[PDB]
């Protein structure tokens, strides 16, 4: 795949960035290890809470070309069965069938 899930992921990448990204460097020293307290409580920890989404947990991403999720590699950013198709083809350099 749906254009809405694709999108979202590209929006998110994006938003994030303004937030995550910069933040994060803060998280952590404002809660977590670190923090004083003044911090963490939240507030200072709402810097993490308000953006969210932008978080890596989500960001993810995913395939990409097909969009798709939970079925892709990534080293190629590609689905997979589309990796594969591709490979037969030779559209990825150095990539071949395989035997041992």
């Amino acid at each position: 795949a749906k254009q809405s899930m694709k999108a979202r992921e590209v929006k998110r990448v994006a938003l994030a960035d303004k937030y995550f990204a910069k933040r994060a460097e803060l998280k952590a020293i404002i809660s977590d290890v670190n923090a004083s307290d003044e911090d963490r409580w939240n507030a200072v920890l709402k810097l993490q809470t308000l953006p969210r989404d932008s978080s890596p947990s989500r960001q993810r991403n995913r395939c990409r070309q097909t969009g798709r999720p939970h079925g892709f590699l990534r080293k190629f950013g590609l689905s997979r069965i589309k990796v594969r198709e591709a490979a037969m083809r030779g559209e990825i350099p150095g990539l071949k069938k395989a035997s041992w």
Binding site: L73, I81, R84, P93, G94, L95, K96, K97
Partner: protein
């Protein structure tokens, strides 16, 4: 006087073209001075993979594929006007890649 610096590196898919590239630069480099050598083989990479064979379902199956990467030390420890370039190219390109830094 010659030296160490440089480093050189050479990568890539590929044997090949690594290599031809060897090569272009290592016979060059012999060439000017040196400061060479014999190119070492150095480990290649050989990755890989297993993927679903059907688009849907599956038991079992799956799939299996490989890529790949030749590597590389070529190697050379010192730059020269003809090995500079190449070094330029090697990079110009693409199917190879080239790093020069001593580190």
């Amino acid at each position: 006087m010659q030296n160490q610096r440089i480093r050189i590196r050479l990568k890539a898919f590929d044997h090949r073209l690594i290599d031809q590239a060897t090569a272009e630069i290592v016979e060059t480099a012999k060439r000017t001075g040196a400061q060479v050598r014999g190119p070492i083989p150095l480990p290649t990479r050989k990755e890989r993979f297993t993927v679903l064979i059907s688009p849907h379902v599956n038991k079992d199956a799956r799939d299996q594929y490989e890529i790949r990467t030749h590597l590389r030390l070529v190697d050379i420890v010192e730059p020269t006007e003809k090995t500079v370039d190449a070094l330029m190219r090697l990079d110009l390109a693409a199917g190879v890649d080239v790093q020069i830094s001593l580190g």
